[PDB]
């Protein structure tokens, strides 16, 4: 608005009596998120090489620009520190349901140091987090912008594609760490993608990872069964990297007999199509229009 106001979040409710423009974020989901919706940070955090954290390699509108124009802007994790957090002078501090650490000890110590909100996008669509975003933020306007410009290109881009429907699945392991990680929908990620009319594959109890005997956050690991079964087994993309990715799965005979190894109906959806927006969508749709 244009003047003070209240906000509410999950369950804490928190007055606005006064924000500079100041937006501050913790998690890289949101960082990502509110620089999409035309809402720069400050002060932020990174994880792993995603790009889209990077210089201007790999960025959308590229509102990034501005954050660093001011110095301001953490890329780099590993011992959080109140204090330094506080030296930052924030203002309004955004969480996301979900991180690479916990926040759930920080979250407290960063609503003291300033206003820290928390937004639950694992229980609602991504389409009804854009819309909170809009309204704690006030970027209504934007967002009318954006959804129209990019309404239409789904439009057409769902008719662009022709293919029958079916589910599909995502797995990313490394040869050197030895390790299999997968990816669930439960991220932002996949919420996008069922908005352009795609099914993601759904393991129940699995997910729960039943191999960490518990409960973890971030991704999910895997015994090797769904794995090997990719999963739904009617469609798999390759998100772990380009030829790289197919060339492991080859020299993986327990993905061998996967389905779209078979059919050869794996795309590379690659690291920077992490997200989904009008400017990158012009790589990632014709990327995934270059098979048909």
């Known amino acids: 608005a244009d003047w003070p106001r209240q906000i509410t979040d999950s369950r804490g409710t928190h007055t606005l009596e006064s924000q500079p423009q100041r937006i501050v974020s913790t998690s890289v989901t949101l960082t990502g998120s509110l620089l999409a919706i035309d809402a720069p940070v400050i002060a932020s955090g990174a994880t792993t090489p995603n790009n889209r954290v990077a210089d201007d390699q790999g960025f959308l509108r590229q ?49 003291t140091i300033a206003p820290t909100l928390i937004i639950n996008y694992d229980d609602k669509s ?86 960490s005997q518990g409960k973890r956050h971030d991704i999910i690991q895997l015994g090797g069964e ?15 990297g380009d030829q790289k990715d197919a060339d492991a799965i080859y020299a993986n005979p327990l993905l061998a007999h996967l389905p779209a190894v078979q059919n050869k109906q794996v795309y590379a959806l690659g690291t920077e199509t992490f997200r989904l927006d009008y400017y990158s969508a012009m790589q990632v749709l014709d990327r995934l229009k270059a098979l048909f």
Not at 63 to 82: C, D, F, M, T
Not at 226 to 240: H, I, M, P, R, V
């Open 226 to 240: 769904n794995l090997a079964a990719g999963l739904n087994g009617e469609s798999l993309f390759l998100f772990a």
């Open 126 to 211: 991504w389409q009804s987090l854009l819309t909170q975003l809009g309204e704690i933020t006030g970027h209504e306007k934007q967002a009318a912008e954006r959804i129209a410009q990019f309404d239409k290109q789904l439009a057409a881009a769902k008719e662009q594609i022709k293919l029958p429907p079916q589910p599909v699945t995502a797995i990313v392991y490394t040869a050197a760490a030895h390790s299999a990680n997968l990816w669930t929908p439960e991220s932002a990620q996949g919420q996008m993608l069922e908005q352009l009319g795609f099914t993601l594959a759904k393991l129940p109890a699995g997910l729960n990872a039943s191999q």
């Open 63 to 111: 509102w990034s620009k501005v954050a660093k124009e001011r110095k301001l802007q953490r890329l780099y994790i590993g011992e959080p520190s109140a204090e330094a957090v506080a030296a930052q002078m924030p203002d309004l501090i955004l969480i996301s349901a979900t991180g690479g650490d916990s926040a759930l000890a920080l979250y407290d110590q960063l609503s």
